Structure 1
């Protein structure tokens, strides 16, 4: 779904691939529907002689992707509403959602199995399904999510930093512009910039935080993290500010470089949010009609240089120098479509 989504926003797409894709898409939907419970839930196995019990992360996951899926291929709305309802039956005012995750293999997700990290996923998935903030399930989830931020905000020891990243996009997506920037300022300070490329990570080789859970998912935490925060930056209700998107462009430089040789990323839940975050950036940046984009860079002392960025040029690093000792330069962009100006 997210590859089909990303390929469409970039503009690089083909009908011989769209058709080859939809086949693997419509089939997988119907094959997935084969493991649905009578109550609207879904289980790792299926419904093996009626004995199987539901896993609250896979249902929520199914729903987040059946929300997305529904845009290209048609999905029966009953399956989402059936799931949504079952998710509400597993919803306690305090502690928002219940962890009923009975599975064999956990490389499937990045959640720390915590009620905070689980609810933090169900709340995005629920918001991502177009649902109002006045909804009773989101009302009892958002309240839990504010209590989860103020408790995780008490110090450095506050469920570490994974939880912290999901709380950003959830808030942004919900509309607390104020609480969004409140969590975003303390994450931006806790970030790790590099050669013009910022990111987020757990403690490199832990040493201090010791007590293993099954196996190490750290290479998948760092991928998922950044891309979750990129969405929070892009997700402003009026429109993201120039200050939001220019900081978002730096996050993009890291994730795009940090890519799996063959294609994709380390785990699966980190491949999904990377593509969703890239495509959502790609929607904000790219333009379809305004092919022209004129740029002009001058200096106080008779310097002049200008370029034409467009569909035939974007794929090219247009560079220029002329070194005048005391710099007093003016960057002037015109037309439509974005341009990234890196000065070294």
Structure 2
């Protein structure tokens, strides 16, 4: 669905690839509907026995996929509202979204296992869902965000990539301008932009090594982090500026220098979020009909 978004925004698309993609879209949708819950979650579940559970991060993913489904095709709003009540039920006494582990393989989850980070991602997903920045759910989320924010700022270390990326993303979509200029400053100080060389990472060795060879369970999120922050970077409701957008273009250059073109990547997370980036950046950088000009 996100490459359908891509092509529908590129202005490149055909009705036949459209037809087949609709077929596969409906197929995936109905297959997912087979996997629906009694209560409205989604997981790898043995339900029809009352003592069973759902999943959190997976359910964030299914909710965003249903968002795109509504963006293209038919989908039941009762289901998304069921998902969101389940979200509300799944929060703590006063904290935010815990991590209810019932998954087969933890390779897919690109996170720091922290309830606050789960909460942040789901809640910015729900910020894409139409509601306020002051909803009780986003509000308690924002509480967790601010806590994480202080721990990361005045802490010298905050996982250095993941929590800070999702936090910049979240508080960026909250409505924060100059604080996100501040995280821009912090991150560009933690940068490896070179005058005559293109590359984007630190020495890549982790702090808590599992396996130590090939970095098991760690996708390394190389283009993924930069893509997240750039996604946050492009956005301004009335019109973004010239500095932010030209810097966005040049980092798009550096990241397409750092991405490949074989079609698909070694994972799904960095893939879908790079796809977000390419789609909306192409929609933004140009029109769809203005095609005649002599500069």
TM-score surpassing 0.5? yes
Corresponding position of 2:143: 143
For 1:283 and 1:261, the matched residues in 2 are separated by 20
Q: Alpha carbons of 1:85 and 1:176: their partners in 2 closer, same or farther (altered >3 Å)?
A: same
For 1:243 and 1:43, the matched residues in 2 are separated by 43
Q: In the TM superposition, what is the alpha-carbon distance from 1:130 to its structure 2 partner?
A: 2.1
Q: In the TM superposition, what is the alpha-carbon distance from 1:66 to its structure 2 partner?
A: 0.9
Instruction: Indicate yes or no: 2:98 matched with 1:126.
Output: no
Q: Is the 8 A contact 1:110 1:270 kept in 2?
A: no
Corresponding position of 2:176: 176
Q: In the TM superposition, what is the alpha-carbon distance from 1:211 to its structure 2 partner?
A: 8.3
Deviations 1:159-192 (A, max 9, x none): 3321111112212222122332222221122122
Q: In the TM superposition, what is the alpha-carbon distance from 1:284 to its structure 2 partner?
A: 0.9
SS in 2 for 1:70: helix
Q: Is the 8 A contact 1:168 1:180 kept in 2?
A: yes
State the TM-score, normalizing by the size of structure 2: 0.89
Q: Is the 8 A contact 1:60 1:87 kept in 2?
A: no
Corresponding position of 2:165: 165
Q: Is the 8 A contact 2:2 2:275 kept in 1?
A: yes
Q: Is the 8 A contact 1:10 1:286 kept in 2?
A: no
Q: Is the 8 A contact 1:93 1:141 kept in 2?
A: no
Q: Alpha carbons of 1:192 and 1:83: their partners in 2 closer, same or farther (altered >3 Å)?
A: same
Deviations 1:232-283 (A, max 9, x none): 1012233321111111112212332333553122211111111011111111
Q: Is the 8 A contact 1:234 1:244 kept in 2?
A: yes
For 2:10 and 2:66, the matched residues in 1 are separated by 22
RMSD of equivalent CA atoms:
2.8
Q: Alpha carbons of 1:98 and 1:202: their partners in 2 closer, same or farther (altered >3 Å)?
A: farther
Equivalences, count: 294
Structure whose CA Rg is larger: 1
Task: Identify, as 1 or 2, the structure richer in strand.
Answer: 1
Q: Is the 8 A contact 1:220 1:266 kept in 2?
A: no
Unaligned runs of 5+ in 2: none
Q: Alpha carbons of 1:200 and 1:191: their partners in 2 closer, same or farther (altered >3 Å)?
A: same
Q: Alpha carbons of 1:202 and 1:144: their partners in 2 closer, same or farther (altered >3 Å)?
A: farther
State the TM-score, normalizing by the size of structure 1: 0.77
Unaligned runs of 5+ in 1: 294-343
Of structures 1 and 2, the one scoring higher in RCO (CA 8 A, sep 6+) is 2
